Amino acid sequence: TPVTLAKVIKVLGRTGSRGGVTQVRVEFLEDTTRTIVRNVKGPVREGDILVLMESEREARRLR
Amino acid sequence: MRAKWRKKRTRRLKRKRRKVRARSK
Amino acid sequence: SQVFGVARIFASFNDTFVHVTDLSGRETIARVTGGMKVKADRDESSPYAAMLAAQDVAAKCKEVGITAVHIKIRATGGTRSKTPGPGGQAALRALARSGLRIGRIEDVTPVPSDSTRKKGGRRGRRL
Amino acid sequence: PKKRASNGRNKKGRGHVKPVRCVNCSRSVPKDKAIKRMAIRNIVEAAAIRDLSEASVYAEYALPKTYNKLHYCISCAIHARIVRVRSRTDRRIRAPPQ
Amino acid sequence: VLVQDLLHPTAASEARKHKLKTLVQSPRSHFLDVKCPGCLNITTVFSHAQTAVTCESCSTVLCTPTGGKAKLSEGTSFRRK
Amino acid sequence: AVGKNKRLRVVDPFTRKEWYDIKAPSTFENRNVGKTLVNKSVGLKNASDSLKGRVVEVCLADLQGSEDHSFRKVKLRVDEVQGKNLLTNFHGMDFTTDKLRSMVRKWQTLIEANVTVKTSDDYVLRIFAIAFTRKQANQVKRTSYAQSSHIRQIRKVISEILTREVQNSTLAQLTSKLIPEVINKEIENATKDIFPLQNVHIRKVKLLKQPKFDLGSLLSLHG
RNA sequence: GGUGAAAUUCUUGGAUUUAUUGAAGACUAACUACUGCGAAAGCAUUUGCCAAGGACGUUUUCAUUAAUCAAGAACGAAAGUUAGGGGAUCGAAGAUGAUCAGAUACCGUCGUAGUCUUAACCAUAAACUAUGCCGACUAGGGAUCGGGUGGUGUUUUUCUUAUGACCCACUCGGCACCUUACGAGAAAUCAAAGUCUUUGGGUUCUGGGGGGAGUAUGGUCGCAAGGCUGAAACUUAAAGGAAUU
Ligand SMILES: [Zn+2]
Ligand SMILES: [Zn+2]
């Protein structure tokens, strides 16, 4: 379970079936300054650094 | 107008139906 | 070198099938498939069921060696649920990242040219 | 009273229409009055375009935007939260915002 | 509106109007001198012949059936009456 | 158990079976598309018997190279054994259900027609056709609707071209007319005066009946 | 199989699945739309035949020829009825597991028969656009289907205008819509409910508080089912429509 760490440059806005995924823009520090966003939920601000698993992922709407 | 007493009327006309049936049959 | 086929994914709202089928058109392998593994009796059609079935498919593929197939993402059709639910996505994705040869994803949802009337009486279901 | 001039149907010169069934509950409904929907939707989630694009021979397969048609009796069409209710003085506008 | 003078309306009013609705009733369409390439059968045919009118002398059928206004069959010269 | 056996391991298909090879009609670049497996070809009910006659859907971009041979698929018929190979005869061609579903959009009509025609050979073939209302270069009429008499004129026209082509030649040359969609171009140029009529295409060519043995083409496909 | 979750299934004598071929019947989804056609019930594929019909064309003719209309007739959604015909995942009652405080409301499986055709009834409905049918006059816009009226318009070039195709200017006819009244209205709202105490263009109708009750009783139509016409006595001072809190 490779672990990587990310910070949000700008929060986007909650969305989901009933509030599913907390949009947390994962600037995984090894490839910081990018806009790739992955599966994150939780309380949200900007300034924290948390854990993301995959370095590279894509996604459409979480229907 | 209120259809709840109309549902009463529906039911009781089914009643008249069975009763006139029993007499006439 | 390559041999192609169709995995014949069969996505319902319950217990989605998988069956490797070469382009011979009538040749599946090991009917024992996803109707076996997630024995929670309501996870038969869950994304985890799909992904696990997909590792089963990758293993089956390698032990039979046909690296390639084609993709018919399928609904139940008839008079019910002509849009496959979740019971297809994870199996596809894990098969894709499971060392196979992808090709020709397509839609065989059989919308009938106006066949029989649907089921449930005029009023239908209640909720 | 007089709520929806079209009776929420939009035929207004007709007076019979062949029925149409649901697909979430399998309930009938008049066609024009009903709420069905077209889905020009992606064949696969773009949470897969990378892997699928790579492990595909004949590089750059078309990636077809599949279509479909769902049929909802207004029951399912508000139970599954498609159409959102409004007021009177706002209901009038028809042109969907997206 | 709110003032007008309709007794002798300007011609464009009628031109933009339909008969049977004008001020002074009148029709639109009119006759035509059909002139055949052959013998100079200087004939008269109305603009809506409605029927297979033919030249008297030579069988050079002139006005084909139409929806409305006649159609000269590409050979005759017409003189508006 | 939950899966019940009221009563009222499986190993090694591979050795208990064998592969056999696609052998496409000569009009295709590749005389092979894929493999099949089948019971070991021991006589006394040779499974090669329960091999002849099968059908297979394949890609024509695959057997003629160019990708634009994509959204049609060709059905081929298994005919007879050549040993490790199967020279398949032609059986038909359709769109891919997705693409045909794709061209159907709103605010334009469809125009459909059917026909059934015989051939130079004795192979009775049913053929269909679809077409649609073009929207003129300067066209603003969002509708683009095709009034009925126009429909019937165009439909008949299609029937005459197809009749002029089918009942006139052999199977492989029919495929050759098909793959270039020359028939398409004939239709377009003939019909363009009637109505703009774009997305004109064909489809769904199917077999009905053939004479009993006809070893002729079944052996002439290859030497 | 299932929503919030179970029973009932054949088979290791073969199965929910895989394709390969045979038969009934329903209906033409997608395009199928604030879009057609009819009197209204309705009617969706393609074709032939049969007539019918409307609308527009009209420098044809008949010369008040008519509009509605108790009596009388025709059609008449779906249900049912008689017989015959067909007999399939799409079915009232009846079986059938749990939700079972109680399921003979829900809900899954099995499912007669109406579901369909032919011969006859049957004559209702949320047959409501809840706006009877004519016809006469008035407000502004745009779209749209069937016609035509012009335009060197454009493209296809059968072709030059146009008739194919469109485009733009004018209409006349089909379902309408959005601003909208000063005028209505009790109001929600009005393209008819406009032109109404500043009361009358003409006709066919139907009802005077609610129940009792469209009930009883007579006729009458039908084989019943059933309608059609259908009162009181007694009881009661409110039922009730819109609209706001
Ligand atoms: Zn529904
Ligand atoms: Zn002459």
Swiss-Prot record, chain A:
GO terms for cellular component: cytosolic small ribosomal subunit. It comes from the Eukaryota. The keyword Ribonucleoprotein applies. Pfam families: Ribosomal_S28e. Signal peptide: none annotated. Belongs to the eukaryotic ribosomal protein eS28 family. PANTHER family: 40S RIBOSOMAL PROTEIN S28, SMALL RIBOSOMAL SUBUNIT PROTEIN ES28. HAMAP family: Ribosomal_eS28 (MF_00292). This is Small ribosomal subunit protein eS28. It comes from Kluyveromyces lactis (strain ATCC 8585 / CBS 2359 / DSM 70799 / NBRC 1267 / NRRL Y-1140 / WM37) (Yeast).
Swiss-Prot record, chain B:
InterPro entries: Ribosomal_eS32 (IPR007836). Its main location: cytoplasm. It comes from the Eukaryota. One of its GO terms (biological process) is cytoplasmic translation. Residues 1-25 are annotated as: Disordered. It is found in: Cytoplasm. One of its GO terms (molecular function) is structural constituent of ribosome. Keywords: Cytoplasm, Ribonucleoprotein, Ribosomal protein. One of its GO terms (cellular component) is cytosol. Component of the small ribosomal subunit (SSU). Mature yeast ribosomes consist of a small (40S) and a large (60S) subunit. The 40S small subunit contains 1 molecule of ribosomal RNA (18S rRNA) and 33 different proteins (encoded by 57 genes). The large 60S subunit contains 3 rRNA molecules (25S, 5.8S and 5S rRNA) and 46 different proteins (encoded by 81 genes). Belongs to the eukaryotic ribosomal protein eS32 family. Component of the ribosome, a large ribonucleoprotein complex responsible for the synthesis of proteins in the cell. The small ribosomal subunit (SSU) binds messenger RNAs (mRNAs) and translates the encoded message by selecting cognate aminoacyl-transfer RNA (tRNA) molecules. The large subunit (LSU) contains the ribosomal catalytic site termed the peptidyl transferase center (PTC), which catalyzes the formation of peptide bonds, thereby polymerizing the amino acids delivered by tRNAs into a polypeptide chain. Present with 11900 molecules/cell in log phase SD medium. This is Small ribosomal subunit protein eS32A. The gene is RPL41A.
UniProtKB/Swiss-Prot annotation, chain C:
The keyword Ribosomal protein applies. Keywords: Ribonucleoprotein, Ribosomal protein. One of its GO terms (cellular component) is ribosome. It comes from the Eukaryota. PROSITE patterns: RIBOSOMAL_S11 (PS00054). Residues 106-127 are annotated as: Disordered. Residues 118-127 have a biased composition (Basic residues). GO terms for molecular function: structural constituent of ribosome. Gene3D superfamilies: Ribosomal protein S11. One of its GO terms (biological process) is translation. InterPro entries: Ribosomal_uS11 (IPR001971), Ribosomal_uS11_CS (IPR018102), Ribosomal_uS11_sf (IPR036967). Pfam families: Ribosomal_S11 (PF00411). Belongs to the universal ribosomal protein uS11 family. NCBIfam families: PRK09607.1. This is Small ribosomal subunit protein uS11. The lineage of its organism: Eukaryota, Fungi, Dikarya, Ascomycota, Saccharomycotina.
UniProtKB/Swiss-Prot annotation, chain F:
This is Small ribosomal subunit protein eS1. The modification N-acetylalanine is found at A1. GO terms for cellular component: cytosolic small ribosomal subunit. It is found in: Cytoplasm. InterPro entries: Ribosomal_eS1, Ribosomal_eS1_CS, Ribosomal_eS1_euk. The keyword Kinase does not apply. GO terms for biological process: translation. Belongs to the eukaryotic ribosomal protein eS1 family. One of its GO terms (molecular function) is structural constituent of ribosome.
